[PDB]
Every structure is written in structure tokens, then in C-alpha cells.
Design a protein around this ligand. Sequence first.
Ligand SMILES: *[C@@H]1O[C@H](CO)[C@@H](O)[C@H](O)[C@H]1NC(C)=O
Ligand SMILES: [Cl-]
Ligand SMILES: [Cl-]
Ligand SMILES: [Cl-]
Ligand SMILES: [Cl-]
Ligand SMILES: [Cl-]
Ligand SMILES: [Cl-]
Ligand SMILES: [Cl-]
Ligand SMILES: [Cu+2]
Length: 235
Amino acid sequence: HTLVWGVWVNGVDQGDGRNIYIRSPPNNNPVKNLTSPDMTCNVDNRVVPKSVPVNAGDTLTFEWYHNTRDDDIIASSHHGPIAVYIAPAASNGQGNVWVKLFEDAYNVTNSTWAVDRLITAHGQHSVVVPHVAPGDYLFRAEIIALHEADSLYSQNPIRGAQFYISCAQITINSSDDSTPLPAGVPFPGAYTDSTPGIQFNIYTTPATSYVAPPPSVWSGALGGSIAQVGDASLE
Ligand SMILES: *[C@@H]1O[C@H](CO)[C@@H](O)[C@H](O)[C@H]1NC(C)=O
Ligand SMILES: [Cl-]
Ligand SMILES: [Cl-]
Ligand SMILES: [Cl-]
Ligand SMILES: [Cl-]
Ligand SMILES: [Cl-]
Ligand SMILES: [Cl-]
Ligand SMILES: [Cl-]
Ligand SMILES: [Cu+2]
């Protein structure tokens, strides 16, 4: 159970984004139904009044939280991967539009899942804004918690992989559009019951064997990481 509080750009807090520039759902409950429209931008997908201005090469940092800002972030039981996608705002997330900018699942040398590291990072994980066409975008951050993903939701609706999905309205101002945005995938649609990484048993299978759901990260993606960039408590 987790939600996005807001974002930072180049290490500078853009302020509380909830229902402002984040298309916030009313609570931190997971989405589980892979075929639901809720998979796109969670259960209250609508245009919110602000969109965060950025330029290509900027560092865009999502900040997540559990109940209050900079708390325990997400329950440590929720081991799983983290991905970030982008689509043009004109789509409203419909169609084959989502392009993957970041993937992190399991890190063998630290023996930590992405979620484990997110907690350590005070909820913060980042992407570098790519050289796409200037305009309005949705950046869709997705945490998948696997602690009940030995079952499929389609078969047993009280279990299944849990998706914490958040869409930020982002305006890209300065960019040379030298890596124009390619073909992406649909949500809902990309993840099905057979997709690698959707059904997995974290209690018996080694994490080193885990493969995250495709698609793979776009070659045009400029970077990213799970790591605290800013100290919320200083505000
Ligand atoms: C999953 O979502 C689909 C698409 O909206 C819907 O038809 C189906 O009833 C949902 N499953 C459950 C258990 O609600
Ligand atoms: Cl509810
Ligand atoms: Cl659901
Ligand atoms: Cl605005
Ligand atoms: Cl708070
Ligand atoms: Cl960190
Ligand atoms: Cl540029
Ligand atoms: Cl980064
Ligand atoms: Cu939860």
C-alpha cells in the first residue's frame, strides 16, 4: 500500500502533487485486475490542473509514501520490481503508447529488490527526461508487489500480483526531439497471466531467477535509479 506524494526535478521539490499534477487515486489500495482500465493510471484517471515543467536531460524523481510523507514508504513484505513508462498526454494512456524508461527488479550483489531499495531511498526513484518532442506527457510509475503473486487474480481474486500505479502530468519544454518517441505497449494489455514476472513465488524461487514483465527498456532512455535525491524532513 503506497502512493506518490509528488516529484522533484534536478533535486528540487516541486511541492505536494496529489490531485494537482498527480492523477491521484483516493487511497493506497493496489490494482490487481490486469484487464481493467484501472491499469492505465489507477482508479481515478482524469486530467488534473497542473503539469510539471521539465527539459530533456533533467532528473525527474517520484516520491512515494504509505500513510504520511517520508514514513515507512511501503510494507517491507511487498518485495517486487519498479518500472517507469511514458506516453504522450494526447493519448490519455489509451492505445499502444507506453514506452519503458526504467526497470529495476532484483540486485544480486546487495541481495535487494527494487522495493527494498525504494524504502531505503525514502520513497524516491528517478528517470532522466529523454529527447522526445516537446509537449505534454504522462509518466506512469509502477511498483509490483509479489508477496501474493504465486496466485493469479484472474483465478483467485483475493490474491495475485499487486500494482501500485501513479501517473504524473509532465510538460517537456526544452528538447531537440532527437530521440522521437517509438512504439509502446498498452495498459491494460501488456501484462497477461502468462507474462513473465506476473506469477512468481518469492518464497521458493530464487530472486536471481526472477524476470520482470516486458517490455524492455527503450534504448533512447537516458538513465535512472532508485535513490534519495532530496530530504523531505528539511522542509
Ligand atoms: C476485470 O476487469 C474487466 C475489465 O473491466 C472486468 O470486466 C472484470 O469484471 C474484472 N474482474 C473482476 C473480478 O472484477
Ligand atoms: Cl476503495
Ligand atoms: Cl483491481
Ligand atoms: Cl500547468
Ligand atoms: Cl504528511
Ligand atoms: Cl538512497
Ligand atoms: Cl535537448
Ligand atoms: Cl537518475
Ligand atoms: Cu499493500
